[PDB]
Amino acid sequence: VDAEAVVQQKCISCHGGDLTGASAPAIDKAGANYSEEEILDIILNGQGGMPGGIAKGAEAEAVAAWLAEKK
Ligand code: HEC
């Protein structure tokens, strides 16, 4: 999976093109604040104002792993 491309396709509408926030909060340093598993849970299931189901399976996992390293 190409995680950066999945993020550009599905996450920037709310998180901003450079992930520094737009309508929703920044996620450009999410790995500094969340573990990979916490990030995966949020992607699959949503959290607070974020809907669940935007990414699934291996795609979600690849995105979680990629963001987990951004600090
Ligand atoms: C890909 C499509 C996405 C990824 C990866 C993430 N999001 Fe979201 N998101 C949205 C809101 C309104 C929030 C705040 C909810 C809260 O944390 O109380 C979030 C939150 C996150 C978080 C956690 C907090 C942080 O800023 O790191 C992460 C790691 C995250 N999101 C990753 C809204 C939306 C949204 C609007 C409809 C979309 C398309 C996405 N989020 C998509 C992604």
The domain ranges of the chain are 1-71
Technique used: X-ray
- The answer to whether the CB of 9 is under 6 A from ligand 1 is no
Buried b / exposed e over 27-48, threshold 16 CB at 10 Å, is beebbeebebeebbbbbbeeee
Q: How many angstroms does the Cα of residue 42 sit away from the middle of ligand 1?
A: 7
User: Is 29 within 8 Å of 70 (Cβ atoms)?
Assistant: yes
Surface-to-core class of residue 3, CB atoms within 10 Å of its CB (0-12 exposed, 13-18 middle, 19+ buried): middle
What CATH code is assigned to 1-71?
A: 1.10.760.10
Nearest CA to ligand 1 atom 10: 50
Resolution (A): 1.7
Q: Does the annotation list 15 as a binding residue?
A: yes
